[model samples]
Target: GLFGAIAGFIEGGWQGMVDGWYGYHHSNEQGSGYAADRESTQKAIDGVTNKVNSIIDKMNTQFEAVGREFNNLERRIENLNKKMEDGFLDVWTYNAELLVLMENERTLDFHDSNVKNLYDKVRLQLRDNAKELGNGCFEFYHKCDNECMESVRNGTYDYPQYSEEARLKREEISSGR
Candidate 1:
């Protein structure tokens, strides 16, 4: 009675629990409205099911080859990422190889957004993980990789000096020396 119970109990109550907007209105009604509601909901579900099913059917039959190639790009990136994680490839080496793949016709001609998004997700980890190492350089795990001291100057990317010394040095490293 301390609550609205006193008012409801004395004010002839809510005239519900058995009438007015209560059990009486609903009790007199069949479940016809619910049936109709369910029917319309079924129709909408069927409509969406058919719409997306048709698209999936078309893709399955017509774009079989396309889908395979689409998956190929994603697989290539995944395989390379595994190699990097396995300690065989550094981030710089990983991304350099990915650049070649991303630039190739297979990846470039891919019109969908997913493969690019996946590539960007995997590829950016290298650069994003690096911390500023001063002298316009950056490092990851105390390892100067990707854009390092020589690669950065004047607050911009500096092209490699392609003199004979540089060429011989590159060749020296490439020969596993």
Candidate 2:
């Protein structure tokens, strides 16, 4: 908008200056000194003005191009950092999950006294591992812990008393009829 306005104003002013240089009276318009010099001087002025405008336009183009490149570089680097952080977190989760899976699949003879001690130790270790897993992947930690605890609560962890209580409850309700 400024370019259009300024160009229009400059052209108007130059036209006025050129018109005034060649006056109304025929003899005034045909002056040997003024007429001969004005054409060459105006042509030289126009040439220099065009060259400067062209240089300024080129500089603006270069600045805009470099600005876009810098913006793109910033975006790319930010995305890379985000992905690296996610990948590291995934690796941590994978290892922790593997440990939990192995712990869950373990079989121990709880009837033997020495084995019972070891089984208690294993249960304590499972609790500790649950805490660690939750801490490491805190985002999904509570949900995973809730699911694991829920499974243990639902008689899946070999607690003899758990099923005994359920059996008693079922018998009481059935006999009430």
Candidate 3:
């Protein structure tokens, strides 16, 4: 074939040049670098290409995963907005109904048996609604225990005397106490 013949001519040309320059003949010598061990060199090239392609594939996969996460975040924000809208609608309807009843003065006396039954149902709903907002109507535990709630009179936990004692203890530790 033309390929093999070309390769051989190139090898022979390089061999002739080397032999002429050095005044020696060595059949075992490899020719110019282009005259590679074809099978081994081709396999090496293939392996390297495979490895590089694999790394590129992994990077693409990571980018796709990040995109998916962004889409999920967007969907969650949309869902939360819908839920908030639903809550607002419920409160608006309940208030409108109450306003109509008040304006009509269609007296359903609070003490009536039917009123008690309906009020109980409404109270339960309000309680549940309130729980969904700010962890109940009020929370004193967090307010009282937070860093902002400091002892008014004492002001500071570490007084000058305490600082002096702490400094001495630290010095003792530094000195292998």
Candidate 4:
């Protein structure tokens, strides 16, 4: 029950308990007990403080990573937008001219306009999907980071296992939920 006693002492519900113990031991000749008690108290406080600090440091690292990802996502978005805007007319115009030449020459397979349009659509869709994937990854990363930090702050973090919030966040991204 030593840990139980330690926990009780830490909880501080038993008023005057320390005072009574001190009074009972006030006349004791041995001062080493006091030193030992002080040392144990220091150790306990240091232990909890170290854990909290460590958690904070880890959360800070996560935050930094998320910030970097956000920057990357922003740059990608801008690049994608500018590229699509500037290249849209050129890309479609070239495809159209190519289709017309292919049709006039009859030198190739399916010369259907619909086929060309479909190919264009799929190409554009692929690019959009790539951007979307970047966005999704950023979303999932930020969410997981926030959840883990919250868990650490709430003292609910468990080592050697993933947090439920994090697990669900990952699952959501993986399953497209």
Backbone clashes, each candidate: 0, 0, 0, 0
> lDDT tens string, model 1, 84-152?
566645765787587556544332233123223322332244343333332222233223323332232
Candidate 2 regions with alpha-carbon error over 4 angstroms: 1-73, 107-177
lDDT tens readout by residue for model 3, 100-157: 5763332222112222332234234333211222211211111122222122112332
Give the TM-score ranking, best first: 4, 2, 3, 1
- How far is each candidate from the true structure, as Cα RMSD in Å? 35.2, 43.4, 41.4, 32.5
Q: Compared to the true structure, candidate 4 yields what TM-score?
A: 0.22
The TM-scores of all predictions, comma-separated, are 0.17, 0.21, 0.19, 0.22
When 1 and 4 are scored with lDDT, the better candidate is 4
Expressed as tens digits, the lDDT of each residue in 41-158 for candidate 2 is 4554575466556545644333322123336549887677668778979997897688556533331111122222322443443342222222111111122233334343232543
lDDT by residue (tens digit), candidate 4, 51-150 = 5566456543323221223365498776766676669679868976886575444312221222233223323423322122321111222222444433
lDDT (CA) per prediction: 0.35, 0.36, 0.35, 0.37
Q: What is the lDDT of residue 128 in candidate 3?
A: 21
- Candidates 1 and 3 compared: the better one by TM-score is 3
**What residue pairs clash in candidate 2, if any at all?**
none
lDDT leaderboard ranking:
4, 2, 1, 3
lDDT score, candidate 2, position 29: 24
